[PDB]
């Protein structure tokens, strides 16, 4: 499955996965082709945040679904 990461940039990302892939491995595959820091990556999916030490199967993330990436700093 190819699940789609909605950025705060314009530039939109393919994420290459099945339901066993970790939220750790989601944050590594966004730091790869975009360069976005793990503390900036506030990931949101339907009633829920994506908590970091977890599976894709915890959240009901089905094939070709949109993950909503918010870039959250510590100041403005």
């Amino acid at each position: 499955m190819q699940i789609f990461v909605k950025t705060l940039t314009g530039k939109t990302i393919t994420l290459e996965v099945e339901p066993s892939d970790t939220i750790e491995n989601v944050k590594a595959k966004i730091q790869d082709k975009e360069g976005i820091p793990p503390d900036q990556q506030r990931l949101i999916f339907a009633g829920k945040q994506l908590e970091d030490g977890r599976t894709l199967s915890d959240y009901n993330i089905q094939k070709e679904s949109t993950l909503h990436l918010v870039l959250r700093l510590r100041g403005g």
Binding site: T9, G10, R42, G47, H68, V70, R72, L73, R74, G76
Partner: protein, 149 residues
């Protein structure tokens, strides 16, 4: 050019009701001054409601970030209870030049969906969410049912 920028966001919101946004003008039909309005995030104190934001996207757009000031008053650490103003720094200060308003109002929807005291706006509402998980569920659910109608 600000004229060859907003009319792409106006037509792309008109074709797609599944994205949840109205870009409804403050004059009649210009190229800049907008009520950018999203639908409320469900299973949460911000569920089911029209969340109204006044927007100057400044003169040098595509390059300048939106001045996002809420008409609908929201009890949240990153979005103002008293004034209207917002803290999220790459949305309001340090812009990427190809972010659409169809992506930026869905960023405020995802900012409300799970609250965090991290980018600070109204300082006593951030102190309240660090202290509380009972009177924040009283005040934010009442404010969504009155101000986001």
């Amino acid at each position: 050019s600000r004229a060859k920028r907003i009319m792409k966001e106006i037509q792309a919101v008109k074709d797609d009701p599944a994205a949840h946004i109205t870009l409804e003008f403050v004059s009649e039909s210009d190229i800049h001054h907008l009520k950018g309005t999203f639908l409320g995030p469900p299973g949460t104190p911000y569920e089911g409601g029209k969340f109204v934001v006044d927007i100057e996207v400044p003169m040098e757009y595509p390059f300048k970030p939106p001045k996002m000031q809420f008409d609908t008053k929201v009890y949240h650490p990153n979005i103002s209870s008293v004034t209207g103003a917002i803290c999220l720094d790459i949305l309001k200060n340090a812009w990427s030049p190809v972010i659409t308003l169809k992506s930026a109002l869905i960023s405020l929807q995802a900012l409300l969906q799970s609250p965090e005291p991290n980018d600070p706006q109204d300082a006593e509402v951030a102190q309240h969410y660090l202290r509380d998980r009972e009177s924040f569920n009283k005040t934010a659910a009442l404010w969504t049912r009155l101000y986001a109608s």
